[PDB]
A paper describes a structure:
The salivary scavenger and agglutinin (SALSA), also known as gp340, “deleted in malignant brain tumors 1” (DMBT1) and salivary agglutinin (SAG), is a multifunctional molecule found in high abundance on human mucosal surfaces. SALSA has widespread functions in innate immunity, inflammation, epithelial homeostasis, and tumour suppression. The first 13 SRCRs are 109 aa domains found as “pearls on a string” separated by SRCR-interspersed domains (SIDs).
SRCR domains 1 and 8 (SRCR1 and SRCR8) were expressed in Drosophila melanogaster Schneider S2 cells with a C-terminal His-tag. This yielded the structures of SRCR1 and SRCR8 at 1.77 and 1.29 Å, respectively. The fold contains one α-helix and one additional single helical turn. The N and C termini come together in a four-stranded β-sheet. Combined, the data from SRCR1 and SRCR8 are thus valid representations of all SALSA SRCR domains. The placement suggests the ion is bound during the folding of the domain and is modelled as Mg2+, which is present in the original expression medium and in the crystallisation conditions of SRCR1.
Author numbering: 99 to 207
The structure:
């Protein structure tokens, strides 16, 4: 069962992006980690909208195989794994590129 979390931030609605894929939490190393991408993360978590998308392991480096690399959300999607992307677990990037998000945390549902 796919799941998403933001870790090592100040609260549920900010931190390093991690996706539960086939039993292990994996990070995102997108070098075009954009507002549209972050907005999808925030919507999916019920965390409002993306105030910023901190880059390059701002919230620290994750560990283990990296789940997603080039994720190109339109910005409307309900889940990050619904955005166009260039594959699971097939990436040469390092955890120094792990993406992060800071959401408004203005959701109530
Ligand atoms: Cl980051
Ligand atoms: Mg992107």
């Amino acid at each position: 069962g796919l799941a998403l979390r933001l870790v090592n931030g100040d609260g549920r609605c900010q931190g390093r992006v991690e996706i539960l894929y086939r039993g292990s939490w994996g990070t995102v190393c997108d070098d075009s980690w954009d507002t549209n991408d972050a907005n999808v993360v925030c919507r999916q978590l019920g965390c409002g909208w993306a105030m910023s998308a901190p880059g390059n392991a701002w919230f620290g480096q994750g560990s283990g195989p990296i789940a997603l690399d080039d994720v190109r959300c339109s910005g409307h999607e309900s889940y990050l794994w619904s955005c166009p992307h260039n594959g699971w677990l097939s990436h040469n990037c390092g955890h120094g590129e792990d993406a992060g998000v800071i959401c408004s945390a203005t959701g109530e549902n």
